N, C-alpha and C. Protein backbone atom coordinates (compact mmCIF):
# COMPACT_ATOMS: atom_id res chain seq x y z
N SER A 1 -1.96 31.96 -5.01
CA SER A 1 -0.38 32.24 -4.98
C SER A 1 0.39 32.03 -5.02
N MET A 2 2.22 32.95 -4.98
CA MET A 2 3.01 31.91 -5.16
C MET A 2 3.69 30.89 -4.11
N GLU A 3 2.61 30.77 -3.68
CA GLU A 3 3.33 29.83 -2.59
C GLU A 3 2.59 27.95 -2.62
N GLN A 4 1.14 28.84 -3.61
CA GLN A 4 0.53 27.90 -2.95
C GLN A 4 0.57 26.55 -4.60
N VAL A 5 0.90 27.58 -4.83
CA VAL A 5 1.96 27.02 -6.35
C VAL A 5 3.07 26.28 -6.08
N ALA A 6 3.89 26.47 -5.33
CA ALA A 6 5.72 25.51 -4.62
C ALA A 6 4.06 24.94 -4.24
N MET A 7 3.65 24.83 -2.91
CA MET A 7 2.51 23.60 -2.21
C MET A 7 2.14 22.09 -3.18
N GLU A 8 1.86 23.41 -4.61
CA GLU A 8 1.12 22.40 -5.26
C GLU A 8 2.36 21.33 -6.13
N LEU A 9 2.98 21.90 -6.77
CA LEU A 9 4.47 21.00 -7.15
C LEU A 9 5.51 20.29 -6.30
N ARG A 10 5.49 20.31 -4.64
CA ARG A 10 6.28 19.58 -4.65
C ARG A 10 5.63 18.17 -3.69
N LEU A 11 3.70 19.07 -3.73
CA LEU A 11 2.57 17.79 -3.73
C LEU A 11 2.76 16.30 -5.11
N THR A 12 2.96 17.13 -5.90
CA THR A 12 3.25 16.43 -7.77
C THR A 12 4.30 15.52 -7.66
N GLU A 13 6.14 16.66 -6.86
CA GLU A 13 6.95 15.90 -7.49
C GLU A 13 7.09 14.22 -5.59
N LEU A 14 6.07 14.66 -4.63
CA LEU A 14 5.73 12.94 -3.59
C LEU A 14 5.61 12.69 -4.29
N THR A 15 3.92 12.95 -5.02
CA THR A 15 3.27 11.76 -6.22
C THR A 15 4.16 10.99 -7.46
N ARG A 16 4.74 11.92 -7.68
CA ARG A 16 5.72 11.20 -8.45
C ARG A 16 6.39 10.21 -8.01
N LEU A 17 7.74 10.46 -6.79
CA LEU A 17 8.12 9.71 -5.95
C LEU A 17 6.88 8.69 -5.49
N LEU A 18 6.20 8.89 -4.62
CA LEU A 18 5.24 7.83 -4.77
C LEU A 18 4.45 6.20 -5.69
N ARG A 19 4.45 7.55 -6.64
CA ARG A 19 4.16 6.26 -7.91
C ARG A 19 5.02 5.15 -7.49
N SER A 20 6.29 6.14 -7.84
CA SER A 20 8.03 4.92 -8.30
C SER A 20 7.61 3.77 -7.35
N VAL A 21 7.72 4.19 -5.61
CA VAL A 21 7.50 3.59 -4.84
C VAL A 21 5.96 2.95 -5.02
N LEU A 22 5.19 2.75 -4.98
CA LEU A 22 4.14 2.04 -5.68
C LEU A 22 4.47 0.82 -5.96
N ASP A 23 4.85 0.98 -7.58
CA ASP A 23 5.53 -0.20 -8.74
C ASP A 23 6.41 -0.69 -7.89
N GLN A 24 7.14 -0.05 -7.35
CA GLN A 24 8.55 -1.29 -6.28
C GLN A 24 7.66 -2.01 -5.71
N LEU A 25 6.83 -1.18 -5.24
CA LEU A 25 6.40 -2.72 -4.11
C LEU A 25 5.37 -3.91 -4.40
N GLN A 26 3.83 -3.00 -5.34
CA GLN A 26 3.90 -3.76 -6.44
C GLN A 26 4.63 -4.58 -6.86
N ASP A 27 5.93 -4.94 -7.50
CA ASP A 27 6.73 -5.83 -7.42
C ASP A 27 6.90 -7.01 -7.22
N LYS A 28 6.66 -7.38 -6.07
CA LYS A 28 6.89 -7.26 -5.06
C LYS A 28 5.82 -8.55 -5.21
N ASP A 29 5.22 -8.47 -5.29
CA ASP A 29 3.95 -9.29 -5.50
C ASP A 29 3.71 -9.52 -6.69
N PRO A 30 3.83 -10.56 -7.37
CA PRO A 30 4.10 -11.41 -8.87
C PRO A 30 2.51 -11.87 -9.19
N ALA A 31 2.45 -12.58 -7.41
CA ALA A 31 0.72 -13.10 -8.00
C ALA A 31 0.02 -12.76 -8.26
N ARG A 32 0.30 -11.12 -7.39
CA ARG A 32 -1.55 -10.41 -7.29
C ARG A 32 -2.11 -10.48 -7.34
N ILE A 33 -1.80 -11.11 -5.81
CA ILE A 33 -2.95 -11.31 -4.35
C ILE A 33 -3.43 -10.07 -3.76
N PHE A 34 -2.84 -9.44 -3.94
CA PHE A 34 -2.63 -8.07 -3.68
C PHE A 34 -3.31 -6.66 -3.75
N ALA A 35 -3.42 -7.01 -5.78
CA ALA A 35 -3.75 -6.06 -7.16
C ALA A 35 -5.18 -5.27 -7.05
N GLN A 36 -6.20 -5.97 -6.60
CA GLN A 36 -7.44 -5.44 -5.99
C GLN A 36 -8.24 -5.95 -5.00
N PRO A 37 -9.62 -4.88 -4.79
CA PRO A 37 -9.83 -5.40 -3.63
C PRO A 37 -10.21 -6.49 -3.44
N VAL A 38 -10.57 -6.95 -2.36
CA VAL A 38 -11.28 -8.58 -1.58
C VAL A 38 -12.63 -8.78 -2.23
N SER A 39 -13.13 -9.30 -3.16
CA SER A 39 -14.41 -9.05 -3.81
C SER A 39 -15.26 -9.76 -2.75
N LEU A 40 -16.82 -8.47 -2.56
CA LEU A 40 -17.57 -8.51 -1.30
C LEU A 40 -18.23 -9.63 -2.14
N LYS A 41 -18.89 -10.01 -3.49
CA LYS A 41 -19.42 -11.21 -4.61
C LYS A 41 -18.71 -12.28 -3.76
N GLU A 42 -17.65 -12.78 -4.13
CA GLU A 42 -16.80 -14.19 -3.47
C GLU A 42 -15.86 -14.83 -1.94
N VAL A 43 -16.37 -13.11 -1.58
CA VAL A 43 -15.80 -13.54 0.49
C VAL A 43 -16.99 -12.47 1.17
N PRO A 44 -18.41 -12.67 1.04
CA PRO A 44 -19.66 -11.09 1.49
C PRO A 44 -19.34 -11.76 2.75
N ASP A 45 -19.30 -12.16 3.92
CA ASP A 45 -18.82 -11.91 5.52
C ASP A 45 -17.72 -10.59 5.31
N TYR A 46 -17.13 -10.34 4.07
CA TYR A 46 -15.22 -9.92 4.64
C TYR A 46 -15.21 -8.53 5.71
N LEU A 47 -15.79 -7.89 4.87
CA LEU A 47 -16.53 -6.62 5.97
C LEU A 47 -16.76 -6.67 7.39
N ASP A 48 -17.47 -8.00 8.07
CA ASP A 48 -17.81 -8.68 9.30
C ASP A 48 -16.05 -8.62 10.06
N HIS A 49 -14.73 -8.59 9.17
CA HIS A 49 -13.07 -9.58 9.88
C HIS A 49 -13.13 -7.81 9.44
N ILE A 50 -12.83 -7.61 8.49
CA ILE A 50 -11.67 -6.69 8.44
C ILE A 50 -12.98 -4.76 7.78
N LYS A 51 -12.00 -3.77 8.82
CA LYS A 51 -12.85 -2.96 9.17
C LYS A 51 -12.84 -1.55 7.85
N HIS A 52 -11.06 -2.25 7.43
CA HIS A 52 -10.40 -1.05 5.99
C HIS A 52 -9.82 -1.26 5.26
N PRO A 53 -11.24 -2.06 4.53
CA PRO A 53 -9.93 -2.75 3.73
C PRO A 53 -8.87 -1.81 2.45
N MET A 54 -8.16 -2.60 1.95
CA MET A 54 -7.36 -1.85 1.28
C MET A 54 -6.57 -2.80 0.30
N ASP A 55 -5.85 -2.75 -1.22
CA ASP A 55 -5.05 -2.96 -2.24
C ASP A 55 -4.28 -1.96 -3.36
N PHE A 56 -3.54 -2.12 -3.96
CA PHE A 56 -3.20 -1.15 -4.86
C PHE A 56 -3.59 -1.00 -5.32
N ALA A 57 -5.07 -1.50 -6.35
CA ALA A 57 -5.58 -0.54 -7.08
C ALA A 57 -6.28 0.14 -6.16
N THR A 58 -6.77 0.31 -5.53
CA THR A 58 -7.37 1.40 -4.43
C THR A 58 -6.60 2.47 -3.85
N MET A 59 -5.23 2.10 -3.91
CA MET A 59 -4.24 3.44 -3.49
C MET A 59 -3.75 3.86 -4.24
N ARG A 60 -3.51 3.39 -5.80
CA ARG A 60 -2.62 4.04 -7.27
C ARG A 60 -3.86 4.64 -6.87
N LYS A 61 -5.84 4.76 -6.87
CA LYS A 61 -6.32 5.38 -7.17
C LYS A 61 -6.44 6.57 -6.35
N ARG A 62 -6.01 6.80 -5.32
CA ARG A 62 -5.82 7.87 -4.36
C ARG A 62 -4.14 8.34 -4.25
N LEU A 63 -3.59 7.98 -4.85
CA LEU A 63 -2.20 7.85 -5.52
C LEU A 63 -2.16 9.83 -6.30
N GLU A 64 -3.78 8.94 -7.23
CA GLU A 64 -2.72 9.76 -8.54
C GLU A 64 -4.05 10.90 -8.37
N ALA A 65 -5.23 10.83 -7.62
CA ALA A 65 -5.93 11.75 -7.42
C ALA A 65 -4.61 13.03 -6.06
N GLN A 66 -3.43 12.97 -6.80
CA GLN A 66 -2.72 13.24 -5.38
C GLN A 66 -3.41 13.33 -4.00
N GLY A 67 -3.73 12.15 -3.18
CA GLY A 67 -4.35 12.23 -2.57
C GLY A 67 -3.22 11.58 -1.47
N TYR A 68 -1.79 11.16 -1.16
CA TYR A 68 -1.30 10.87 -0.14
C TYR A 68 -0.24 12.35 -0.09
N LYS A 69 -0.73 13.35 1.20
CA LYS A 69 0.13 13.87 2.05
C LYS A 69 1.98 14.04 2.47
N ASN A 70 2.31 12.85 2.74
CA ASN A 70 3.65 12.46 3.25
C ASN A 70 3.01 11.34 2.98
N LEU A 71 4.64 10.31 2.72
CA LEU A 71 4.61 9.45 3.73
C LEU A 71 3.74 8.75 3.99
N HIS A 72 4.40 8.98 5.56
CA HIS A 72 3.20 8.36 6.21
C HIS A 72 1.87 7.75 6.25
N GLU A 73 1.53 8.27 5.34
CA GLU A 73 -0.57 8.31 5.06
C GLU A 73 0.08 6.96 4.14
N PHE A 74 0.94 7.02 2.53
CA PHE A 74 0.87 6.20 1.69
C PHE A 74 1.73 4.73 2.76
N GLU A 75 2.55 4.90 3.60
CA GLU A 75 2.76 3.41 4.44
C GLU A 75 1.29 2.84 5.14
N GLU A 76 0.57 4.12 5.64
CA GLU A 76 -0.70 3.90 6.76
C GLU A 76 -1.18 2.93 5.52
N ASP A 77 -1.26 3.02 4.44
CA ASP A 77 -2.41 2.10 3.54
C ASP A 77 -1.58 0.47 2.85
N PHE A 78 0.05 0.90 3.36
CA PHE A 78 0.64 -0.40 2.68
C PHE A 78 0.61 -1.51 3.84
N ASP A 79 0.10 -0.71 5.22
CA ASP A 79 -0.11 -2.49 6.03
C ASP A 79 -1.49 -3.18 6.46
N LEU A 80 -2.30 -1.20 6.01
CA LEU A 80 -2.97 -2.12 6.07
C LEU A 80 -3.19 -4.29 4.87
N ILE A 81 -2.96 -3.35 3.85
CA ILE A 81 -2.57 -4.81 2.62
C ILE A 81 -2.25 -6.24 3.82
N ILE A 82 -1.28 -5.86 4.36
CA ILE A 82 -0.47 -6.98 4.75
C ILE A 82 -1.34 -7.43 5.51
N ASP A 83 -1.83 -6.06 7.28
CA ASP A 83 -2.43 -6.67 8.08
C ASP A 83 -3.63 -7.16 8.54
N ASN A 84 -4.70 -7.06 7.02
CA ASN A 84 -5.44 -7.42 7.17
C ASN A 84 -5.46 -8.99 6.27
N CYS A 85 -4.17 -8.56 5.58
CA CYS A 85 -4.35 -10.40 4.62
C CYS A 85 -4.01 -10.87 5.48
N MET A 86 -2.78 -10.76 7.27
CA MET A 86 -3.01 -11.35 8.01
C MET A 86 -4.12 -11.95 9.23
N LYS A 87 -4.43 -10.74 9.31
CA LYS A 87 -5.56 -11.31 10.30
C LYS A 87 -6.32 -12.46 9.50
N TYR A 88 -7.52 -11.88 8.29
CA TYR A 88 -8.17 -12.96 7.33
C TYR A 88 -7.54 -14.40 7.11
N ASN A 89 -6.68 -14.62 6.83
CA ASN A 89 -6.37 -15.72 6.57
C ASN A 89 -5.49 -16.44 7.75
N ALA A 90 -4.94 -18.09 7.69
CA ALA A 90 -4.49 -18.44 8.48
C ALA A 90 -3.06 -18.71 8.79
N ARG A 91 -2.10 -18.65 9.36
CA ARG A 91 -1.08 -18.40 8.54
C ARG A 91 -0.19 -19.83 7.80
N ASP A 92 -0.74 -20.83 7.29
CA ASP A 92 -1.13 -22.29 6.34
C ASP A 92 -1.06 -21.64 4.98
N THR A 93 -1.33 -20.41 4.62
CA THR A 93 -1.97 -19.83 3.67
C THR A 93 -1.09 -19.50 2.53
N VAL A 94 -1.66 -19.55 1.30
CA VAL A 94 -0.54 -18.89 -0.21
C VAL A 94 -0.14 -17.88 0.82
N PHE A 95 -2.36 -16.95 0.32
CA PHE A 95 -2.29 -15.39 1.05
C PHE A 95 -1.89 -15.29 2.59
N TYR A 96 -1.58 -15.73 3.32
CA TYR A 96 -1.00 -14.85 4.30
C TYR A 96 0.55 -14.88 3.97
N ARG A 97 1.53 -16.09 3.78
CA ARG A 97 3.05 -16.54 3.09
C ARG A 97 2.79 -15.17 2.60
N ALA A 98 1.82 -14.65 1.54
CA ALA A 98 1.86 -14.23 0.46
C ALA A 98 2.66 -12.24 1.25
N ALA A 99 1.47 -12.67 2.46
CA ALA A 99 1.46 -10.75 3.17
C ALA A 99 3.41 -10.80 3.06
N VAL A 100 3.40 -11.86 4.54
CA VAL A 100 5.27 -11.93 4.63
C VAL A 100 5.88 -11.16 4.11
N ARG A 101 6.11 -11.95 3.34
CA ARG A 101 7.04 -11.53 1.70
C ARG A 101 7.33 -10.33 1.58
N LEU A 102 5.95 -9.99 1.47
CA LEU A 102 6.06 -8.41 0.44
C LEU A 102 5.91 -7.05 1.43
N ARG A 103 5.51 -7.78 2.89
CA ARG A 103 6.85 -6.54 4.25
C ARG A 103 7.07 -6.68 4.20
N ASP A 104 8.28 -7.94 3.74
CA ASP A 104 9.66 -8.13 4.02
C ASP A 104 10.74 -7.77 3.23
N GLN A 105 9.70 -7.84 2.22
CA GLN A 105 10.59 -7.52 0.73
C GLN A 105 10.45 -6.11 0.25
N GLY A 106 9.05 -5.18 1.07
CA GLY A 106 8.57 -4.05 0.86
C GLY A 106 9.44 -3.58 1.95
N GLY A 107 10.71 -3.34 2.90
CA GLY A 107 10.95 -3.26 3.92
C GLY A 107 11.91 -2.13 3.45
N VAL A 108 12.83 -2.98 2.67
CA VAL A 108 14.09 -2.14 1.72
C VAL A 108 13.51 -0.47 0.62
N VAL A 109 12.87 -1.07 0.36
CA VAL A 109 12.01 0.05 -0.72
C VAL A 109 12.01 1.19 -0.03
N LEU A 110 11.16 0.60 1.36
CA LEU A 110 10.85 2.05 1.93
C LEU A 110 11.88 2.83 3.29
N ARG A 111 12.23 2.20 3.29
CA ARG A 111 13.61 2.63 4.33
C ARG A 111 13.88 3.78 3.36
N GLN A 112 14.39 3.56 2.32
CA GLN A 112 14.97 4.45 1.53
C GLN A 112 14.11 5.39 0.71
N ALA A 113 12.90 4.99 0.31
CA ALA A 113 11.89 6.56 0.60
C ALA A 113 11.50 7.38 1.71
N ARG A 114 11.99 6.67 3.01
CA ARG A 114 11.87 7.78 3.32
C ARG A 114 13.08 9.15 3.39
N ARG A 115 14.11 8.29 3.02
CA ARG A 115 15.44 8.91 3.07
C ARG A 115 14.87 9.85 2.21
N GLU A 116 14.98 9.62 1.14
CA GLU A 116 14.60 10.56 0.25
C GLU A 116 13.79 11.82 0.45
N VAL A 117 12.79 11.48 0.66
CA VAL A 117 11.41 12.09 1.32
C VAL A 117 12.22 12.99 2.17
N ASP A 118 12.90 12.94 3.02
CA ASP A 118 13.18 14.28 4.04
C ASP A 118 14.42 14.21 3.39
N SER A 119 15.90 13.45 2.68
CA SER A 119 16.85 13.95 1.96
C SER A 119 16.55 15.83 0.66
N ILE A 120 15.27 15.22 -0.05
CA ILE A 120 14.28 16.13 -1.37
C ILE A 120 13.82 17.24 -0.49
N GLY A 121 12.86 16.46 0.67
CA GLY A 121 12.22 18.08 1.86
C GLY A 121 10.98 17.71 1.07
């Protein structure tokens, strides 16, 4: 149908906006601490601690499959990155500190993304 197409064009445009958002959030991680999944070869007990792992490469796969229906779903995954790290790692670690800085700096980007998503519809 014409409606299904219009729907698909909306999703494609949302995907375009979320790709830009993801690139902006990932720039706030210049150390690349959050770029890839925590390695289960190197942290073999990780899944005993963290039940829903997340990272930027995994979000990017979902994004490119147009797997985010709305900004809320995207934000859920970004929050998993931060929250998983803040649980697994102690306060006095470069990892925890990196997550705090990513959260703080990402807030600005996500604030305007919500306005753009509502605005453009």
